[PDB]
Structures are given as structure tokens and as C-alpha cells.
Amino acid sequence: AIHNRAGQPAQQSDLINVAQLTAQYYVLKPEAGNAEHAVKFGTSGHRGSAGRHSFNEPHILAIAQAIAEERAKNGITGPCYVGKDTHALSEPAFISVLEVLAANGVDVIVQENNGFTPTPAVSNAILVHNKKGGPLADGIVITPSHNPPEDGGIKYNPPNGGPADTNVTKVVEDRANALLAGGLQGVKRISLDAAMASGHVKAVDLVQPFVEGLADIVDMAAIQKAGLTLGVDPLGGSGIEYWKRIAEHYKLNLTLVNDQVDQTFRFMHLDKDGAIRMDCSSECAMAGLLALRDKFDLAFANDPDYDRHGIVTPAGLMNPNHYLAVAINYLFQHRPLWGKDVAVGKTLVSSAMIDRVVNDLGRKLVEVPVGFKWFVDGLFDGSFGFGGEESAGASFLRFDGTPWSTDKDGIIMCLLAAEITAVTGKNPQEHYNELAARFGAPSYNRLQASATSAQKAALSKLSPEMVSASTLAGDPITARLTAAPGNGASIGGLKVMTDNGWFAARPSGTEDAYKIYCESFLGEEHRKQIEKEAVEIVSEVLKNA
Amino acid sequence: AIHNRAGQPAQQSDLINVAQLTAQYYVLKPEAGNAEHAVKFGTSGHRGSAGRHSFNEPHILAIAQAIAEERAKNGITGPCYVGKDTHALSEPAFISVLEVLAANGVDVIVQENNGFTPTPAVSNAILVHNKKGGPLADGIVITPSHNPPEDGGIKYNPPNGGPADTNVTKVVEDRANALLAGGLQGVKRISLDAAMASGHVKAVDLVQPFVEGLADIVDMAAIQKAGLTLGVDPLGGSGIEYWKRIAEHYKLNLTLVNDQVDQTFRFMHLDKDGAIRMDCSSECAMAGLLALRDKFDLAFANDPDYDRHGIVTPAGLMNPNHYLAVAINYLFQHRPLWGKDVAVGKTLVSSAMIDRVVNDLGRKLVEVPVGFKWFVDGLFDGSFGFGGEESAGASFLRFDGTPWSTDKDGIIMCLLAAEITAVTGKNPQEHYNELAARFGAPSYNRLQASATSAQKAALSKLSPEMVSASTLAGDPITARLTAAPGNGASIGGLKVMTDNGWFAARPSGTEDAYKIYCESFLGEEHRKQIEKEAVEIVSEVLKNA
Ligand SMILES: [Mg+2]
Ligand SMILES: [Mg+2]
């Protein structure tokens, strides 16, 4: 809570001019020779804003062309599910995608009545389609997640239903930039009217199959029976009709605390930094729902692409790590059809409460570097029952151990909290309190500082031997890691562990800086000692960089 | 109220998708040969919606080109003041105008910071500019007035500051449609960036000079001294910053009841027909302010272009026709510099209360046909002190009898209500009560019935001798009119008068029907006898063909 208007309702002065920004998509163009305006198409696709010359018609035409080409080269001939969120720029982007996909002879499936579609609803659609064993489906999701109102995003999900990885994204990025440099000569395009008349664009209801399918992944009958008073802040996002449909279809006492869809997102409370950001895990952004927390047994919210979740109880907004540990602890004791081998995916900076829970359940922990990409294959083939990120995104398998969404799914994570409460009679925070009473209440913190460009490079080229420390804050070190133990993938940094605590140091992805994540099960003072020693270790190893 | 939800707050389901509509401006086009998609550029300019292929980039490019050409032909080489309202489609239309005007070498003056500008602010800017006597300025107002959120409009005001008349609009319309049929070949256009770099687009604050200028038309010192508690619903329109600046500059106890600017206009109460229409004279649309009316001595609202006014007191929303009479009766007794050479304008269908007031004051009444256009020249040369129309639009002179706005001005009409209240100690409704006591309370109504295109044609080609009746509802007929007595212009219908009442019949311009406006100073029963006989007279004079 840094900003002085953090947590306060947005004011008119905070808001964008939606129609102007949308005009800018068409009338402004990336600058020849300007790297800031180029396509940057990564793990979350390409994001930017029309007013900054970084999310405009030429970008989306170029990206859509590159995706059409790539998918064809990869032998994908089934439909492309194209979903969009509630950001303003998702509308012009969606149209550009249809124009180019249809021109390249791609069969596109869209939500009818220009509706909105969660990331996991695209993932789920792809998976359900491909299970049929015919021509392969893939998809595009037109969202910048929880970015502010002026931003747009677009990303690709290949036939395994998860985010595209760098083997695809880099080729797409280079191709799109080549097309921009070429004045879009290589872009094939037809008018929106022609695309709709072409037969290549099919409008369907994606909502009902997804909503009815939930019964195959969450215990909707136990939820119904419990008769809980449930609340949701849809945060003006892409799954607002999904929540309404879930309440209707499952006859739940589930109340939307507001039902606003507004491309200025003016209904939002401002985030910690005074911006309008639809972050379901942020206390400031969640101030609206938190002021009503006493009215519900359980409440929740989702970011605009509905791949992330925030869990509220009368006690407040749960810490996302705390919830992951509780979700895992519950699922692995309440999913008998999951094979003995089905494993638990965890990122290296997530809480070691996860480790403790997993060890207690006699289940395999597969620790991976940060990034949901590391869970996709294991969710897909059913070897990971669960994969989550401490950034409040996770997914888990259907009851029968087959995948539901291989991208993160905020809806199943929220409904899982309701299942937990219903089946056990205790909400997820009460469950966390019991974990803390059993194992101790860990103290977690993140630090950051500048590094020179050379130091930042050095930090990602360490070897365990470069670290001679044998103790960390009074305990014997049990591991010094530069690769994730679960999958052997490089951390691009360092993790050091003891039985009582750990730290991980990683370069920042966007600045010449590094971050240190650390956690102690002995408390605040012990954690502060870990911090001091982590900084000492990192300084020593980068001293010559 | 006709619609079940009239006067209710809009629901989400009532709202447009702003970015989609704005995208349609660019990606949809009018259908070649389809008259419904053609430019229709009349008294209010051209209005339509991008979603109906009637307000899209090609229309605006074509109209801007036609205006550039027409103004040059008419010897206008000073700047063009280009103002816009708060409708979504005003944003892309604004950009289109800039691109074409700059391409044509036209100097353009705009409100700084992409701000919004009332119709009368454009009119005033033109007049103030041209009083300096160099190259002539003109203007464009990008507004569809109070039309629903999905609509756009654009209209032209020549150097006399008033709405363009048919001698100009018909020519602009033909040229625009020729350009459309010609695939925009004769349209000169440069990019928005080029237009901004060209030096042809100058941004200024139009607000401050307008606000400071008000002291030369309304008695702001008297209003200040009275210390009234005033309220305003800006109705998310183009003058919202004007009301704020007025309050601050003149140190008034004037509160905005909301300060929303929202291209969905979701804050509105639904109009009589369930649409979202920003009509300041509609009780349904004004339900929000009316709910708050006990909080203020006097309150105001304006339609999005701020050329019309709504006057509220604790008794409710004033009937616009009543307010005109009150405005005239007050002004001509509180404007000593408007000598005997300054007349009162009145349209054909306005109340005969105006006749009574004007006679009582020993002033000249100039009765004109329906249409504000008939007041422009008289306002411009000072020979008309005031001219208003029944739909709550009017203007009047500065204190010294020179023009302020030759288009309708909502701001001066709202502030006049405050001046009346401050100077006299009686609000405008209280003044109407006194007029009713002096002259009787007239009973006014409008009737309509079906008419063949042929009967409507006959209706407009009548002569006084065709009305053989010598009495109307028991009184001798004192006038049988087919031309307006004040300026001799054809009325395109018939008006019959006695000392106690009158009716006027005109063909409908939008339906196969005729309309009869009727009023009696004897009361409702007498008015109904006037109706009966009017229908008989109309039937008779049209029994022909
Ligand atoms: Mg997200
Ligand atoms: Mg208007």
C-alpha cells in the first residue's frame, strides 16, 4: 500500500478515453526504427498500448499472419478458438485476428454475441476438441491479463492447450517483425464482413460446455448441499457470465457483488501504486470485496483473463502461497482416482509449506523454475495432479486424472475453495491455520537491489560449487541449487536450502537488478538472518563480475 | 413514460461496447447504392452509427473534404474551430476531420488536452474571432446532440456562428455523397501524426474565454450576491468542465450532482422509450436530478452538445414552453440597452403566452416558421434580442445587444434562470405562475394522424383562402396563415388563430402523417373543441387528393 489513494475508488481523472484509444489502434503506427514499438511476443504473448504505438493494427495483423503460417507449418488443420477479455483494445485486436485468420483459410470458433472468454475456457475447449482424435484445434487469447485499461495483449495456445513455448513464440515474433519491416506486404486479409460470410468463422456458446464440465473436476454436489453463502467480485472480467451461469446451473447461493463491465474499469479501487489494475490477489484492488467479507462464508475474484484467483474469507484476502499449500493438502486426500504416481508441481520460489504438505502425504514433489510453462506437459499427460505459482495461478486434473485446462484456471481454483469449505466444514484460511499449527507459521519476504549489467549476467551463470557456504542462519545447508530438482531445468540463479529455511536469488527480467526470495519456518528474526546471509552470498559470488 | 423501465437506472444489458463500436467506424463501411447509408447532412448535420454503416470513416472523410472545399469557395480562409462532444464516435470523427482539414491546408483550432466543447462555445469562438475583422473563421461541431450512445454526428457553423443553412448543407451533402460514390478519390488526407506536425492544428483553451465572457451576457454579480444553493447534472456532456469553471471563477455555490464522463452513459436513467438519451427536457432522463431537487434553490442540466437546457426547481422539471415565456418576460424588462429596435423571435408552434407577454411589454413580436435557423440572422445583427424553440433550445444577446452565440446556448439559458431567481427573489416557475394569473393558464397539445404522401404534399401547398371557416371553437378567426407573419416565410402548413386559441397543422417530416399543434387560453375543454375543429378543417382542405 504505497500510494496515498491506494485502495480508494477510482475517480474520473483516473480514467481513459476508450473511443480515443481505440481510434489510436487504427490511426497510429509503430515508428520505423523504434525498438520500443516492435512486437515482443513471449510467454504471455505481446502486450502494449495503442497510445504508445505498441498495440496497433499493424502489430495484430502481423502477429495473426505469423500464427496462421506457423500453425499450418506445424500441421494444425482443425479450428482456432479465439477468445477475448474485456479490455478495450481486445475489440479491435479480435477483428484483426478474424480478418487475417479467415484470409489464411483458418477455421475460427468464437463466443457468440461478441461475448468474453477466459483463458482456461480456451484451454479447456482446445483439450476437449483434441480428445476427439481428429484435426487438431489450437487457440488465441486476446488479453493482457490484469494490466491497466489502456493495454492490450494477445497470446497463442497450441494443441496441448497450454501457453505456447519459445520454439513457437520466437518464430512468431521474428516473423511478425519481418512483416512490419516489410510494410505488411505478406499479410493476407479479408474484410470483417467477408470473414463472417466466408464460412470460416463459427460462433458458439463456449460457456455452457465449460460450466457443465465443472462437475467433472470440482465436487459441485457437495458445494450445493453445504448451502454456503458465496460472494464473487467478477472485477469486470472475461468470466463474469461464467459466474452467473455457474450460480444458475448449480443452484448456488452465489452473489455477484457488482456486475459492471466497463472498458474504463472505473468501478475499481486503485491498486497499491494508484493505478487501475484488476489484480485479484492485491488487497488494494480487492478493497471493494473485502469491505463485504463479513457477508460471505467465502468470496473470490479473478483477473480479467480468469486464469488467476483471489480467495476471501471473513478473515481477509488469503495469501496466494497459503492457499496453494491448502489446495494441495486437500486435493491429494480427496481425489482417490488419481494414481499413486500423480505428482505435485511447485515453482522454486513458492512456500516450503508445500514441501511439508507433500512429504506428509507421501506424494512426489516436482520443483520447477518459475513460469507455468513447466507444468503444461505434466498436466497434459496426467503426471502432475496440480501445478501452481505463488503469483495466484494454478490448475489441477479432472477427478479421473485427465486434464481440464493446461493453462492456469482461476475458476476451478475458486470453486475448489468452496469444495474445501463444504466437504470439510472449514474454510481454506482455517485449514492454513491448522497447517501453521502443525509445521510452524513460515515468514516469507522478497528483496530487490540493483546490479550492473555484467553482475546480472553473472548471476544466471553460477554453479553450485561457486557457493562455499555450509550453513545458513545457523542450520546446515541441505542443498545449493542452480537447477530445479524436479525437472533439472536451469534456475538462471541460485537457491540455498536448510531444513528450516531457504533463499533463492534470480536476476530481474526487466531491470538491471536481482531479487531474493526467502522464507523461514522459525519466524521473522530467523528470516532476517537468512536475508542478511543471502545478500552476503550473492555479493561474494558476483564480486568479480 | 411508455417503456416499463422508463426513468430507471440503465442496466449493464442496456450498454454499448464502446471499443467494438469505435472499431466498426474503421472496419465497416456504407453499402454502395444503399440510401440508408448515405450522407444525410441537414439542419443538424449528418448523424448515424458505425454499427448501422451510417457513421464510419468514409462518411467523415467525405464530409470534411466537402466542408474544406465549400468554405474555400465561400471566401473563408481563417481557422476552423473544431469541437467535439462526449459520444464515443466523436473521437474517431474528430481525428478524421483533422487529417482531412490539415491535408487541405486548413488551419484548425481545437480544445487542448483532447477536451470537449459545447456547440455555443464553437459559435461564440467564431463570433469573437470574426469581430477582429481578418480572414474569416468558421467551425465544426462533432455531436449528435442527445442521441443514444451508439450514435455520432457532425455539423458545420459558418462565419456568422450559426448552424449552416440549406444553401450550404445541401451542397456539402451532394459533394460528400459524390466523394463516397467516387471511392474517396478527391479526399485529401494525411496521417494524424502528419496533421499534428504540419502546424495546421493549434490547441487552445476555449473554456476560459467563454466562462469569463458570461459576465457580459448574464448578471453574474447578482447571482453571486444572492448566494443561492445551485445544482447541475452535467449529464456526462461536453460542458462538464464549463460548469466546474463557472462555479470556481464566479465563486458560486454550485454543485455537480455527478461528474461522470462515460461513453456508455451508464449513469443515465432510461428515457420514456427505454433508450439512453441525454435529453435535459425529458422527465424520465432527468430522474436522477429530479430525485435531488429538494437540495437546491434551482438546478440545471444540458444535452451533450450543451445547446439545450433543463430547468429544475423543487416543484420539478419546468415545461420548456413555459420557461421561454418567463425568459422573454424577464429579459425584455431587465435589458435596458436592448432598445425599440430589438425584437422578440418566436416560432409558429410556441405558446401564445409569448404573444401576450410581448404585447404587454410593448415590444415587437417576430413570428417565424418552425426551426432555429430563422433566428440566426436577427441574433447576428442585434435585431432579435431572443429566439427559442419548443424543444428547450434558445439564445439571446449580450447586455449591449451584440450577439453571444448565434447557435442555441444551453449554458446562458441555465444561468439566466439563476439570474432571474437572484434579481427577483422568485424562481422561473414562480414567474410562470404569475403569468398564468395575469393571462390564464393555456392548455397546449399535439395531435397526429396518418397522411398519404399526397395529402402531406397538399398540406404544404395551401393558401389562406382555402379555409372557409370564419370561427374556431366559438371565436371569430383573426388570422388564416400559410406564411409566418414575422418574416413572410412559407410555414409548409396552416395556422388558424382567434383571440383565445390557435392550431397549426404541418406534414410530418419523418412519417406518413400530419401533426396539429393546438392551444387555448380558455382551458382544456375549449382546447379539445379546437382539436375537433382542426381535424375537421384539415380533413376538409385535404378532402381534395
Ligand atoms: Mg491473468
Ligand atoms: Mg443539443
GROMACS .gro file of N, CA and C in nm, chain B residues 322-390:
model
  207
  867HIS      N    1  -4.305   2.690  -2.107
  867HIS     CA    2  -4.329   2.787  -2.000
  867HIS      C    3  -4.206   2.871  -1.975
  868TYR      N    4  -4.091   2.806  -1.974
  868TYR     CA    5  -3.967   2.876  -1.945
  868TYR      C    6  -3.939   2.980  -2.053
  869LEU      N    7  -3.965   2.950  -2.181
  869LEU     CA    8  -3.939   3.052  -2.283
  869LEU      C    9  -4.014   3.183  -2.249
  870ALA      N   10  -4.142   3.170  -2.211
  870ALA     CA   11  -4.225   3.288  -2.186
  870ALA      C   12  -4.165   3.366  -2.070
  871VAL      N   13  -4.125   3.293  -1.967
  871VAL     CA   14  -4.065   3.356  -1.848
  871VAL      C   15  -3.934   3.427  -1.884
  872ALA      N   16  -3.850   3.359  -1.963
  872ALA     CA   17  -3.723   3.414  -2.007
  872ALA      C   18  -3.745   3.547  -2.082
  873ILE      N   19  -3.837   3.546  -2.178
  873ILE     CA   20  -3.867   3.666  -2.257
  873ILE      C   21  -3.923   3.778  -2.167
  874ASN      N   22  -4.019   3.745  -2.081
  874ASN     CA   23  -4.081   3.846  -1.997
  874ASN      C   24  -3.975   3.910  -1.905
  875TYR      N   25  -3.883   3.829  -1.853
  875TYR     CA   26  -3.778   3.882  -1.767
  875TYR      C   27  -3.677   3.964  -1.847
  876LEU      N   28  -3.622   3.904  -1.953
  876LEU     CA   29  -3.515   3.970  -2.029
  876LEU      C   30  -3.555   4.109  -2.079
  877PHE      N   31  -3.674   4.121  -2.140
  877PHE     CA   32  -3.714   4.249  -2.200
  877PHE      C   33  -3.748   4.357  -2.097
  878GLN      N   34  -3.751   4.317  -1.970
  878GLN     CA   35  -3.765   4.415  -1.861
  878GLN      C   36  -3.636   4.438  -1.782
  879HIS      N   37  -3.531   4.364  -1.816
  879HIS     CA   38  -3.404   4.372  -1.743
  879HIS      C   39  -3.285   4.385  -1.836
  880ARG      N   40  -3.308   4.448  -1.950
  880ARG     CA   41  -3.203   4.467  -2.051
  880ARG      C   42  -3.219   4.606  -2.115
  881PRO      N   43  -3.186   4.710  -2.039
  881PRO     CA   44  -3.217   4.847  -2.086
  881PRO      C   45  -3.148   4.881  -2.219
  882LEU      N   46  -3.032   4.820  -2.248
  882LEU     CA   47  -2.962   4.856  -2.374
  882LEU      C   48  -3.023   4.791  -2.498
  883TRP      N   49  -3.124   4.704  -2.480
  883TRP     CA   50  -3.199   4.649  -2.594
  883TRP      C   51  -3.315   4.744  -2.621
  884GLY      N   52  -3.289   4.838  -2.710
  884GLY     CA   53  -3.386   4.944  -2.741
  884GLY      C   54  -3.500   4.895  -2.828
  885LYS      N   55  -3.580   4.991  -2.876
  885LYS     CA   56  -3.702   4.959  -2.950
  885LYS      C   57  -3.671   4.890  -3.083
  886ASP      N   58  -3.546   4.897  -3.127
  886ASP     CA   59  -3.505   4.827  -3.248
  886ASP      C   60  -3.469   4.678  -3.224
  887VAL      N   61  -3.497   4.627  -3.104
  887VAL     CA   62  -3.466   4.486  -3.069
  887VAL      C   63  -3.597   4.412  -3.045
  888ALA      N   64  -3.621   4.309  -3.126
  888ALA     CA   65  -3.748   4.236  -3.127
  888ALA      C   66  -3.740   4.100  -3.058
  889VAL      N   67  -3.855   4.038  -3.042
  889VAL     CA   68  -3.863   3.905  -2.983
  889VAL      C   69  -3.894   3.804  -3.094
  890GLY      N   70  -3.808   3.703  -3.110
  890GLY     CA   71  -3.832   3.597  -3.209
  890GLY      C   72  -3.924   3.494  -3.145
  891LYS      N   73  -4.014   3.435  -3.224
  891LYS     CA   74  -4.098   3.326  -3.172
  891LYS      C   75  -4.132   3.232  -3.287
  892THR      N   76  -4.123   3.101  -3.265
  892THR     CA   77  -4.165   3.009  -3.370
  892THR      C   78  -4.317   2.989  -3.372
  893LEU      N   79  -4.366   2.941  -3.486
  893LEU     CA   80  -4.507   2.922  -3.516
  893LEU      C   81  -4.583   2.843  -3.409
  894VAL      N   82  -4.515   2.746  -3.349
  894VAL     CA   83  -4.584   2.649  -3.263
  894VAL      C   84  -4.557   2.675  -3.114
  895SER      N   85  -4.488   2.785  -3.084
  895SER     CA   86  -4.464   2.822  -2.945
  895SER      C   87  -4.592   2.880  -2.884
  896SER      N   88  -4.598   2.886  -2.751
  896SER     CA   89  -4.720   2.928  -2.683
  896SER      C   90  -4.755   3.072  -2.715
  897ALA      N   91  -4.885   3.102  -2.722
  897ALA     CA   92  -4.934   3.240  -2.738
  897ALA      C   93  -4.921   3.321  -2.608
  898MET      N   94  -4.870   3.256  -2.504
  898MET     CA   95  -4.828   3.330  -2.384
  898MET      C   96  -4.718   3.429  -2.425
  899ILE      N   97  -4.633   3.387  -2.518
  899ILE     CA   98  -4.528   3.476  -2.566
  899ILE      C   99  -4.590   3.602  -2.630
  900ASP      N  100  -4.690   3.582  -2.717
  900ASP     CA  101  -4.761   3.696  -2.777
  900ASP      C  102  -4.812   3.791  -2.668
  901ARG      N  103  -4.872   3.734  -2.563
  901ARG     CA  104  -4.931   3.815  -2.455
  901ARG      C  105  -4.827   3.897  -2.379
  902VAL      N  106  -4.717   3.831  -2.343
  902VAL     CA  107  -4.605   3.895  -2.275
  902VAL      C  108  -4.550   4.010  -2.359
  903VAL      N  109  -4.525   3.979  -2.487
  903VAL     CA  110  -4.456   4.071  -2.574
  903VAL      C  111  -4.545   4.194  -2.598
  904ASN      N  112  -4.675   4.169  -2.619
  904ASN     CA  113  -4.770   4.280  -2.634
  904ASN      C  114  -4.774   4.367  -2.508
  905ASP      N  115  -4.776   4.299  -2.394
  905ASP     CA  116  -4.782   4.365  -2.264
  905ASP      C  117  -4.663   4.457  -2.242
  906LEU      N  118  -4.547   4.415  -2.292
  906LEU     CA  119  -4.424   4.495  -2.279
  906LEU      C  120  -4.407   4.599  -2.389
  907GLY      N  121  -4.498   4.599  -2.486
  907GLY     CA  122  -4.490   4.696  -2.595
  907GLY      C  123  -4.373   4.673  -2.688
  908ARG      N  124  -4.336   4.546  -2.703
  908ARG     CA  125  -4.228   4.503  -2.791
  908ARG      C  126  -4.277   4.443  -2.922
  909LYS      N  127  -4.187   4.433  -3.018
  909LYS     CA  128  -4.220   4.377  -3.147
  909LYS      C  129  -4.203   4.225  -3.143
  910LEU      N  130  -4.307   4.154  -3.188
  910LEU     CA  131  -4.303   4.008  -3.197
  910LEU      C  132  -4.275   3.969  -3.342
  911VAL      N  133  -4.173   3.887  -3.363
  911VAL     CA  134  -4.146   3.839  -3.496
  911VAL      C  135  -4.169   3.689  -3.501
  912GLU      N  136  -4.285   3.648  -3.552
  912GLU     CA  137  -4.320   3.507  -3.557
  912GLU      C  138  -4.268   3.445  -3.686
  913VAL      N  139  -4.189   3.339  -3.670
  913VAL     CA  140  -4.122   3.270  -3.780
  913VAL      C  141  -4.169   3.123  -3.789
  914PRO      N  142  -4.136   3.055  -3.900
  914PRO     CA  143  -4.171   2.913  -3.908
  914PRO      C  144  -4.093   2.833  -3.807
  915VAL      N  145  -4.131   2.707  -3.790
  915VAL     CA  146  -4.052   2.614  -3.711
  915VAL      C  147  -3.905   2.614  -3.760
  916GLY      N  148  -3.812   2.612  -3.666
  916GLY     CA  149  -3.671   2.600  -3.698
  916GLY      C  150  -3.589   2.717  -3.645
  917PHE      N  151  -3.485   2.685  -3.567
  917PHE     CA  152  -3.396   2.787  -3.511
  917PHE      C  153  -3.326   2.872  -3.617
  918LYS      N  154  -3.315   2.818  -3.737
  918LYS     CA  155  -3.244   2.883  -3.846
  918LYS      C  156  -3.299   3.022  -3.870
  919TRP      N  157  -3.427   3.039  -3.838
  919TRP     CA  158  -3.494   3.168  -3.867
  919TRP      C  159  -3.453   3.280  -3.773
  920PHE      N  160  -3.386   3.245  -3.664
  920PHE     CA  161  -3.336   3.345  -3.567
  920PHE      C  162  -3.190   3.386  -3.589
  921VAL      N  163  -3.114   3.308  -3.666
  921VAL     CA  164  -2.969   3.330  -3.675
  921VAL      C  165  -2.931   3.472  -3.721
  922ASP      N  166  -2.990   3.516  -3.832
  922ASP     CA  167  -2.956   3.648  -3.886
  922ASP      C  168  -2.991   3.762  -3.791
  923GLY      N  169  -3.108   3.753  -3.728
  923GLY     CA  170  -3.152   3.854  -3.632
  923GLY      C  171  -3.070   3.858  -3.505
  924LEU      N  172  -3.027   3.741  -3.458
  924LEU     CA  173  -2.933   3.738  -3.345
  924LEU      C  174  -2.801   3.806  -3.386
  925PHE      N  175  -2.754   3.771  -3.505
  925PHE     CA  176  -2.623   3.815  -3.551
  925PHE      C  177  -2.621   3.968  -3.562
  926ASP      N  178  -2.727   4.027  -3.617
  926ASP     CA  179  -2.728   4.174  -3.636
  926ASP      C  180  -2.791   4.253  -3.521
  927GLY      N  181  -2.826   4.184  -3.412
  927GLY     CA  182  -2.886   4.250  -3.296
  927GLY      C  183  -3.034   4.288  -3.302
  928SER      N  184  -3.103   4.254  -3.412
  928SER     CA  185  -3.243   4.295  -3.429
  928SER      C  186  -3.338   4.199  -3.356
  929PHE      N  187  -3.289   4.079  -3.322
  929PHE     CA  188  -3.363   3.987  -3.232
  929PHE      C  189  -3.289   3.978  -3.098
  930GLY      N  190  -3.354   4.019  -2.988
  930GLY     CA  191  -3.292   4.005  -2.856
  930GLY      C  192  -3.290   3.859  -2.809
  931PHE      N  193  -3.385   3.781  -2.857
  931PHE     CA  194  -3.407   3.643  -2.806
  931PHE      C  195  -3.474   3.560  -2.915
  932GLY      N  196  -3.436   3.432  -2.928
  932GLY     CA  197  -3.510   3.339  -3.012
  932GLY      C  198  -3.497   3.201  -2.951
  933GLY      N  199  -3.609   3.133  -2.933
  933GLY     CA  200  -3.609   2.997  -2.878
  933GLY      C  201  -3.705   2.907  -2.955
  934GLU      N  202  -3.685   2.777  -2.941
  934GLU     CA  203  -3.779   2.679  -2.997
  934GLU      C  204  -3.832   2.586  -2.888
  935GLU      N  205  -3.942   2.517  -2.917
  935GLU     CA  206  -4.017   2.446  -2.811
  935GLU      C  207  -3.940   2.330  -2.749
   0.00000   0.00000   0.00000
